[PDB]
Every structure is written in C-alpha cells, then in structure tokens.
Design a binder for this molecule. Structure first.
Ligand code: 829
Ligand code: 829
Ligand code: 829
Ligand code: K
Ligand code: ZN
Ligand code: ZN
Ligand code: ZN
Lengths: 150, 147, 147
C-alpha cells in the first residue's frame, strides 16, 4: 500500500577520447560522456529517481563504475525498507542510433535492480535538431521510479 | 495491486505553413509543428509505453490514431490506465482556452473519464529554443495497473 | 486504492537585483530569480494540481508557500491525500546541498506531510545551455496522491 514515486534528470557533455557508456552499454562511437565517474547519464538519472522515491536525497549526497553505484543505491533503497516496482526512462541524443542497444541497457538495469525485464523500460528520443542536444553537445537522460515501502 | 509509472518527453520545431496541432486541437497560429507532429500526444504515448514497459513510439510505429493504438497495446499487455498528467512548454501562442478540449480529446482516445486526464501549460520564460519560439516541448506522466 | 501521478516543470531567469528564493529558502547569491519566483514550489504546485487533474498553477492563481498551501487544500477538497513528492533543482550555481533540508521542511510543513515523504535533489547542467551558463534555474517535480 505505501507507494512512492521518484524522478531523475541527468546530462553530460559529449567529448572525444572518452568511450560512450549509457545504461552500462559501451556503444561504438567516436566520442563519449564527460564526468568524474564513467558519466553514465542514464544510470545516474535512474539512481536519482530511486533515491528520490525513497526520500534518501540524491546521488551527490551518497557517492566510478555507474553500475556499481546503481547497485549500491538499490541496496540502500532496500535497506530503507522499499521494494522497487518499476523503472522507466528516456535518453535524448542526436546520435548515435541507440535502438540496437536499448534491450541491453534494459537488461543491465534489471540485473542491477534485481527486477524482471518486464518492470524496466528504456526509451530513446532525438531532440529534433533543437538546442545543445540537437547540436550533439551532450546527452540527457530522464527517469521515473515507483517503489513501495514493505 | 501491480501499479507501474511511465514518463514521456517530446519536442518539435515550429515551422511556417503548418497548422499548429496540440492535443488534437488546431490552434490559430502563423506556424505549426514539424514531424501531424502532435508533441503532446507523442509525450503521452511514450509515457504509456514506458509504464507498460513496451519500449517507445519509434519501436512500434495521425497522432490520435497512434494514441489510440498505443492504448490498444497497453491493454494487450494487460494494463489499465489509471491517470495521465502532462505539461506543454510553449512561449506562444496562449494555450489556456484550448486546454479543456485537449483533455477531452485525450480522455476520449484513452477511454478515460475527464477527471483522470490533465494537461498543463508553461512558457519557458524567454529562455532557450523554447523561449525564442523555435519549438514546443511536452512532458507526460502516466500511471497504469496490471489488472 | 485510487492512486494518481502528477508532474511539474518550472523555469525562471537568473539575474542580479533579485534575491534567490528556492523551496521557500532565501539563498545568499550575487543573483536571483525573475517572476517571489520560487521555481521549486511552482513545479511542485503544478505536480499536485496535475495528480488531482485540477489544471495548473495559472488557472487557479501571495508568496509561493501560501500558493502551495492553497494548492494542497484544493487537492484535499478534491478527495486526494498526498503520498509523496520528489523533485530536482537544476542550477549550475550556487551550491544548494546546505539548503536542502530547509527546503524539504518548508514543503513538508506546507503540505502537512512527514519529512520522509518529501524529497529535493539538486543537479548542475554540466555547463550546457542557458542553465549551464547560469542564465536560469529549472525545477522538476513528481507527486503521488491517492483518493
Ligand atoms: N547547484 C547544485 C548542484 C548540485 N549540487 C550537489 O552536487 C552533486 C553533484 N553534481 C551533479 O550535479 C552531477 C552528478 C552526476 N552527474 C551529473 C551531475 C549533486 O548530485 C548535488 O548533490 C549542489 O549542491 N548544488
Ligand atoms: N538516438 C536515437 C534516438 C531515437 N531512436 C529511435 O528512433 C525513434 C524516432 N525518433 C524520435 O526521436 C522522435 C519520434 C517522435 N517524435 C519526436 C521524436 C525513437 O522513438 C527511438 O525509438 C534511436 O534509435 N536513437
Ligand atoms: N502557452 C501558454 C503558456 C502558459 N499558459 C498559462 O499561463 C500560466 C502562467 N505562466 C507560466 O507559464 C509560468 C508560471 C510560473 N512560473 C513561470 C511560468 C500557466 O500556468 C498557464 O495557465 C497559457 O495559457 N499558454
Ligand atoms: K528540459
Ligand atoms: Zn551524471
Ligand atoms: Zn513527436
Ligand atoms: Zn515559476
């Protein structure tokens, strides 16, 4: 009965000489995301949505392999007494084509959250050529999570 | 009971010689959306696929027909739609007097009562491509239950 | 029972000559938001009206905290109890972490929630766009309610 929702936002710059890692998937591409960690923009947004659902603050309060961060986030959410019910998310990127990699992202997140595949979703959008996202200056992710307090 | 949430995002450019169509409503305006490029129905569509964990709009496919088909697929995965909430971000034109008709369009397409469908509008305070009137963005959130 | 979700978005310009007020907290900074222009409370207000399918902040509507209290009252009177709120402030500067618990406390008090049902997060924009250049501040909110 004790359901809670969270939401998460993250953006990183796209620079050359970094490998591209979104949703724990290394995607072949001539640029990658810039950050202190591996800068996995999708995992960061999801981590934030989970801490938010559980009212545990945010990713900078708590915390690098972003999958390990995601698993520790999930561990702390479980320790606060919440079970995760579902995750949805959107990646907004001009390039590259993310469709061939989506199911793999979905699978990594399921694994890290200990959820079946059917409770995790990843969507991909272009920004229709508008703003810094449209110019391919960075990649944004958005996330939503529903949890319930056991 | 087995609740799930989804979230949707869409943006489209504003261009000359296109009708402005948002939430199924034709709004008098010098320019319209490129793509019927209905940004609001697209966001809601993605929010619903996301909640049912069915992927996204481009993995599946006018916008009202597509919103109807999304609803069909959501029910096919065995979910009922509980509510939809959404925001349109447009510097111009004024959307307020069309919002109720958008809600009515959406409620009909999703076979939902009016009180389970919401549409909100914001400017972007003259900031960015939104503030300059170069595009219109929509955001949506959807709650479903596996019945 | 009858759960519903709302989402909210808000943005304001950051200029000198205005004080910075986010989540009801006055934050010392060379610049502030143009509108009391409380970007966080506006977004949360929008998210609550959205969950209750009551339109948006402009249709209903004093400082932003009284507006939030009136919002919650109307949400109650519509048959809904607030279950939780989560949110994100996106600002390149200044550092918001020290002010987070104050913001949560104001929101919780205004909604009559226990603190552990209100969350506020902070993010930079990695120096991208008008947000990353310190030209505005954005807030996003999600609200869960039940009838
Ligand atoms: N204006 C701000 C912004 C952030 N933070 C705190 O600083 C933290 C790290 N920065 C990030 O914004 C970030 C992390 C991961 N990926 C991309 C960006 C943030 O999580 C918040 O706790 C803060 O105190 N004040
Ligand atoms: N980087 C990306 C981006 C998108 N897609 C896939 O390409 C699809 C279409 N593009 C749209 O972004 C879109 C659709 C409708 N309205 C506005 C925008 C998208 O849904 C995703 O499945 C992808 O494979 N890789
Ligand atoms: N294109 C639009 C945009 C908005 N509105 C109506 O104008 C209202 C207020 N303006 C704001 O967008 C706003 C409020 C607070 N902070 C920043 C911005 C809005 O809530 C909606 O009712 C409208 O009718 N048409
Ligand atoms: K945005
Ligand atoms: Zn990040
Ligand atoms: Zn679209
Ligand atoms: Zn505002």
């Amino acid at each position: 009965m004790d359901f809670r929702i969270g939401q998460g936002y993250d953006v990183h710059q796209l620079v050359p000489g970094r490998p591209l890692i979104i949703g724990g998937v290394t995607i072949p591409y001539e640029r990658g995301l810039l950050g202190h960690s591996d800068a996995d923009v999708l995992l960061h947004a999801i981590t934030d949505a989970l801490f938010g659902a559980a009212a545990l603050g945010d990713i900078g309060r708590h915390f690098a392999d972003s999958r390990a961060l995601l698993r520790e986030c999930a561990s702390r959410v479980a320790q606060a007494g919440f079970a995760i019910r579902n995750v949805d998310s959107t990646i907004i990127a001009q390039a590259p084509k993310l469709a061939p990699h989506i199911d793999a992202m979905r699978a990594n997140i399921a694994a890290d959250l200990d959820l079946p595949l059917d409770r995790v979703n990843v969507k991909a959008k272009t920004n229709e050529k508008l703003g810094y996202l449209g110019r391919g200056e960075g990649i944004e992710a958005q996330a939503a999570a529903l949890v319930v307090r056991e």
